[PDB]
Amino acid sequence: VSKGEKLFTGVVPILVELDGDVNGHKFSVSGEGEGDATYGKMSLKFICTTGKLPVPWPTLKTTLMQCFARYPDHMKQHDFFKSAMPEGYVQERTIFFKDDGNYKTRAEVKFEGDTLVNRIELKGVDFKEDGNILGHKLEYNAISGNANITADKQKNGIKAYFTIRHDVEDGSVLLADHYQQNTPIGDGPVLLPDNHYLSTQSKQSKDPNEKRDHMVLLEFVTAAGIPL
């Protein structure tokens, strides 16, 4: 086992912080939970700390820790995310919502002592004030599916791409086209993978004792696409 992989063999505490601005509507989200990468598992609860969340929770799920993926033994040499730890990586995305605005996100994912911390800035522009996002017309349901990973040797990191299909309350679909770039924070060697994907199985719920705007997730993430 590498130094980075060794940090994830047990249960790891998670802290998430997000500062957001969508069409000048400012909001903050905090999250807490535990990661168990041996089983690809994350258990998370997110709270909007600024009152009412001005966008649907589903639009923030992908923004709110691919280091917790389970890489099968035969694919361990393709796990860039753990290889960058503990110093961490920067994760940047643009998410283009078809016929609506875009989110630009920049996050730093690293260990602070024993805690895996994900610190995120999100900026959203050009949204329709009574579209499906600012109008809150998305179904509060689980998003599952694949994130396609490729090496980015020029940046000593990875790129990813995938589309999320958000269900709209009228039975339409809002496509969220994700472009992702990750770069290591430290100067130590990282693993540059062959092409593969991460498969996410998600269960989304509410805490009946929580009065704050919130989202509870149970996520399972598995690397795939290179045969045993």
Tab-separated table of C-alpha atoms in Angstrom:
chain	number	residue	atom	x	y	z
A	1	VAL	CA	0.000	0.000	0.000
A	2	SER	CA	1.155	3.606	-0.827
A	3	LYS	CA	1.245	6.345	1.881
A	4	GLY	CA	-1.830	7.984	0.297
A	5	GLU	CA	-3.865	4.704	0.008
A	6	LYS	CA	-2.944	3.883	3.678
A	7	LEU	CA	-4.815	7.043	4.871
A	8	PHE	CA	-8.157	5.532	3.656
A	9	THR	CA	-8.002	1.920	5.012
A	10	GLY	CA	-10.349	2.809	7.921
A	11	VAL	CA	-13.253	5.137	8.615
A	12	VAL	CA	-12.263	8.778	7.899
A	13	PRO	CA	-14.130	11.828	9.282
A	14	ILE	CA	-15.376	14.259	6.551
A	15	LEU	CA	-15.907	18.027	6.757
A	16	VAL	CA	-17.332	19.981	3.807
A	17	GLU	CA	-17.616	23.794	3.503
A	18	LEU	CA	-19.251	25.538	0.495
A	19	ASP	CA	-19.570	29.304	-0.090
A	20	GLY	CA	-21.946	29.921	-3.038
A	21	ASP	CA	-23.137	32.869	-5.160
A	22	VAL	CA	-25.796	32.149	-7.848
A	23	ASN	CA	-27.084	35.325	-9.632
A	24	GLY	CA	-25.932	37.317	-6.499
A	25	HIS	CA	-27.944	35.001	-4.112
A	26	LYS	CA	-25.237	34.180	-1.512
A	27	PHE	CA	-25.466	31.021	0.619
A	28	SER	CA	-23.234	28.699	2.660
A	29	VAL	CA	-23.438	24.897	3.137
A	30	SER	CA	-21.639	22.787	5.758
A	31	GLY	CA	-21.412	18.984	5.683
A	32	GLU	CA	-20.216	16.259	8.040
A	33	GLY	CA	-19.952	12.479	7.815
A	34	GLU	CA	-17.633	9.533	7.387
A	35	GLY	CA	-15.847	7.861	4.464
A	36	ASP	CA	-14.997	4.140	4.289
A	37	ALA	CA	-13.136	3.833	0.932
A	38	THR	CA	-12.564	0.085	1.531
A	39	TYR	CA	-16.327	-0.281	0.700
A	40	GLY	CA	-16.561	2.899	-1.457
A	41	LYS	CA	-18.922	4.322	1.196
A	42	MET	CA	-19.727	7.875	2.303
A	43	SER	CA	-22.405	8.793	4.881
A	44	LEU	CA	-23.017	12.571	4.782
A	45	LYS	CA	-25.391	15.260	6.094
A	46	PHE	CA	-25.390	18.794	4.563
A	47	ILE	CA	-27.007	21.924	6.085
A	48	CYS	CA	-27.631	25.357	4.551
A	49	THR	CA	-26.167	27.612	7.337
A	50	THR	CA	-27.558	30.874	5.797
A	51	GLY	CA	-31.296	29.922	5.934
A	52	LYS	CA	-33.150	28.836	2.743
A	53	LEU	CA	-30.966	27.291	-0.012
A	54	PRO	CA	-31.626	29.421	-3.178
A	55	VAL	CA	-30.983	26.482	-5.614
A	56	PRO	CA	-32.187	22.840	-5.506
A	57	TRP	CA	-30.053	20.438	-3.412
A	58	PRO	CA	-29.773	18.093	-6.465
A	59	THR	CA	-27.780	20.773	-8.403
A	60	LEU	CA	-25.081	20.854	-5.615
A	61	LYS	CA	-24.655	17.047	-5.054
A	62	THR	CA	-21.723	16.571	-7.496
A	63	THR	CA	-19.952	19.705	-6.077
A	64	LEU	CA	-20.375	18.696	-2.376
A	65	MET	CA	-14.702	13.559	-2.627
A	66	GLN	CA	-13.724	10.968	-5.287
A	67	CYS	CA	-10.806	9.963	-2.923
A	68	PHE	CA	-13.440	7.741	-1.139
A	69	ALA	CA	-13.994	5.599	-4.263
A	70	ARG	CA	-13.317	1.855	-3.996
A	71	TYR	CA	-10.613	0.980	-6.566
A	72	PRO	CA	-10.595	-2.808	-7.165
A	73	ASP	CA	-7.168	-4.324	-6.355
A	74	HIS	CA	-6.375	-4.718	-10.140
A	75	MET	CA	-6.955	-0.915	-10.679
A	76	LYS	CA	-5.079	0.504	-7.580
A	77	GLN	CA	-2.370	1.998	-9.924
A	78	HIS	CA	-5.111	4.298	-11.479
A	79	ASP	CA	-6.251	5.990	-8.188
A	80	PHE	CA	-4.956	9.574	-8.649
A	81	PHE	CA	-7.189	10.881	-5.832
A	82	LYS	CA	-5.593	8.923	-2.920
A	83	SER	CA	-2.093	9.268	-4.488
A	84	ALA	CA	-2.327	13.096	-3.985
A	85	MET	CA	-3.020	12.715	-0.220
A	86	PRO	CA	-2.401	14.001	2.381
A	87	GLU	CA	-1.386	17.310	0.650
A	88	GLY	CA	-4.515	16.980	-1.500
A	89	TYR	CA	-5.795	18.217	-4.839
A	90	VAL	CA	-7.630	21.145	-6.368
A	91	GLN	CA	-10.929	20.144	-8.072
A	92	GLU	CA	-12.352	22.656	-10.623
A	93	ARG	CA	-15.568	22.213	-12.597
A	94	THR	CA	-17.790	24.068	-14.960
A	95	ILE	CA	-21.332	22.635	-14.958
A	96	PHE	CA	-23.405	23.833	-17.938
A	97	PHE	CA	-27.183	23.499	-17.284
A	98	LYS	CA	-28.809	23.147	-20.762
A	99	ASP	CA	-30.806	26.349	-21.613
A	100	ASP	CA	-29.924	27.883	-18.190
A	101	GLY	CA	-26.876	29.157	-16.264
A	102	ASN	CA	-23.570	27.523	-15.355
A	103	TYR	CA	-21.755	26.821	-12.076
A	104	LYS	CA	-17.988	27.281	-11.803
A	105	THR	CA	-16.564	25.548	-8.746
A	106	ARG	CA	-13.103	25.425	-7.210
A	107	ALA	CA	-12.443	23.102	-4.269
A	108	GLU	CA	-9.433	21.995	-2.214
A	109	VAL	CA	-9.664	18.416	-0.880
A	110	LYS	CA	-6.970	17.491	1.667
A	111	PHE	CA	-6.343	16.117	5.177
A	112	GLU	CA	-6.382	18.526	8.112
A	113	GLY	CA	-5.008	16.125	10.702
A	114	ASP	CA	-7.251	13.055	10.554
A	115	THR	CA	-10.219	14.913	8.890
A	116	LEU	CA	-10.749	14.848	5.072
A	117	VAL	CA	-11.787	18.474	4.370
A	118	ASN	CA	-13.476	19.647	1.147
A	119	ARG	CA	-13.473	23.487	0.955
A	120	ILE	CA	-15.510	24.772	-2.040
A	121	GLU	CA	-16.254	28.129	-3.736
A	122	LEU	CA	-19.198	28.087	-6.208
A	123	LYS	CA	-20.124	30.945	-8.590
A	124	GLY	CA	-23.278	30.637	-10.739
A	125	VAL	CA	-24.188	33.114	-13.555
A	126	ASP	CA	-26.827	33.643	-16.285
A	127	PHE	CA	-29.604	31.658	-14.478
A	128	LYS	CA	-33.326	32.353	-15.295
A	129	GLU	CA	-34.961	33.680	-12.031
A	130	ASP	CA	-38.047	31.417	-12.617
A	131	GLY	CA	-36.233	28.621	-14.494
A	132	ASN	CA	-36.007	25.056	-13.074
A	133	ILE	CA	-33.067	25.987	-10.725
A	134	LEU	CA	-33.899	29.448	-9.251
A	135	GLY	CA	-37.615	28.404	-9.514
A	136	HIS	CA	-37.017	25.165	-7.468
A	137	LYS	CA	-38.785	22.872	-10.018
A	138	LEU	CA	-36.430	19.819	-9.747
A	139	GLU	CA	-37.409	16.484	-8.162
A	140	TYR	CA	-35.546	15.869	-4.821
A	141	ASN	CA	-34.263	12.455	-5.978
A	142	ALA	CA	-30.945	10.527	-5.973
A	143	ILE	CA	-28.373	11.026	-8.793
A	144	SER	CA	-26.399	7.860	-9.767
A	145	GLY	CA	-24.126	7.115	-12.739
A	146	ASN	CA	-20.595	7.337	-14.120
A	147	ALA	CA	-17.781	9.929	-14.007
A	148	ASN	CA	-15.317	9.330	-16.916
A	149	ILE	CA	-11.669	9.833	-15.790
A	150	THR	CA	-8.695	10.521	-18.100
A	151	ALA	CA	-5.059	11.507	-17.415
A	152	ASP	CA	-3.983	15.164	-17.777
A	153	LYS	CA	-0.189	14.797	-17.961
A	154	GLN	CA	0.336	18.515	-18.860
A	155	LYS	CA	-1.213	19.440	-15.449
A	156	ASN	CA	0.179	16.333	-13.596
A	157	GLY	CA	-3.467	15.462	-12.842
A	158	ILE	CA	-6.744	14.188	-14.300
A	159	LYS	CA	-9.763	15.444	-16.229
A	160	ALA	CA	-13.303	14.056	-15.863
A	161	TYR	CA	-16.505	14.438	-17.856
A	162	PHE	CA	-20.092	13.289	-17.406
A	163	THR	CA	-23.711	14.491	-17.760
A	164	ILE	CA	-26.244	14.415	-14.887
A	165	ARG	CA	-29.930	14.179	-15.931
A	166	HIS	CA	-31.973	16.053	-13.261
A	167	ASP	CA	-35.704	15.139	-13.267
A	168	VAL	CA	-37.974	18.194	-13.609
A	169	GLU	CA	-41.395	18.280	-11.826
A	170	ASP	CA	-43.102	18.338	-15.324
A	171	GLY	CA	-41.381	15.042	-16.402
A	172	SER	CA	-38.735	16.919	-18.521
A	173	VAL	CA	-34.965	16.419	-17.827
A	174	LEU	CA	-32.433	19.214	-17.082
A	175	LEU	CA	-28.984	18.146	-18.451
A	176	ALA	CA	-25.996	19.257	-16.332
A	177	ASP	CA	-22.859	18.827	-18.505
A	178	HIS	CA	-19.829	18.558	-16.154
A	179	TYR	CA	-16.227	19.396	-17.142
A	180	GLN	CA	-13.695	18.653	-14.392
A	181	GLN	CA	-9.964	19.180	-13.868
A	182	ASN	CA	-7.968	17.989	-10.801
A	183	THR	CA	-4.386	19.024	-9.957
A	184	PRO	CA	-2.259	17.953	-6.988
A	185	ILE	CA	-1.491	20.558	-4.283
A	186	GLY	CA	1.838	18.906	-3.250
A	187	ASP	CA	5.040	18.288	-5.284
A	188	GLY	CA	5.211	14.519	-4.494
A	189	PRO	CA	4.621	11.924	-7.276
A	190	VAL	CA	0.978	11.103	-8.178
A	191	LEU	CA	-0.589	8.305	-10.214
A	192	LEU	CA	-1.707	9.233	-13.742
A	193	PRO	CA	-4.430	6.779	-14.680
A	194	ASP	CA	-5.467	4.917	-17.797
A	195	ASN	CA	-9.032	5.805	-18.873
A	196	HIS	CA	-11.713	4.466	-16.494
A	197	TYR	CA	-14.864	5.618	-14.713
A	198	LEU	CA	-16.313	5.943	-11.231
A	199	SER	CA	-19.807	4.493	-10.740
A	200	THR	CA	-21.903	6.233	-7.996
A	201	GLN	CA	-24.961	4.587	-6.311
A	202	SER	CA	-26.739	7.242	-4.169
A	203	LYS	CA	-29.630	7.225	-1.607
A	204	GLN	CA	-30.905	10.737	-0.686
A	205	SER	CA	-33.114	11.360	2.420
A	206	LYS	CA	-34.303	13.939	5.003
A	207	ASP	CA	-33.609	13.992	8.763
A	208	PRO	CA	-37.112	14.302	10.379
A	209	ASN	CA	-35.555	16.079	13.474
A	210	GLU	CA	-33.653	18.683	11.318
A	211	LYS	CA	-35.394	22.111	10.943
A	212	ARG	CA	-32.577	23.614	8.817
A	213	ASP	CA	-32.623	23.243	5.003
A	214	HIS	CA	-30.612	20.010	4.600
A	215	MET	CA	-29.753	16.864	2.577
A	216	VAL	CA	-28.742	13.392	3.908
A	217	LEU	CA	-26.801	11.096	1.507
A	218	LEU	CA	-25.541	7.536	1.559
A	219	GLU	CA	-23.164	7.104	-1.396
A	220	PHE	CA	-21.294	4.060	-2.792
A	221	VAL	CA	-18.571	4.815	-5.387
A	222	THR	CA	-16.696	2.113	-7.327
A	223	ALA	CA	-13.940	2.432	-9.964
A	224	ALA	CA	-14.574	0.343	-13.131
A	225	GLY	CA	-13.866	0.146	-16.876
A	226	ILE	CA	-10.593	-1.927	-16.793
A	227	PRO	CA	-11.396	-5.696	-16.770
A	228	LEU	CA	-9.972	-8.117	-14.048
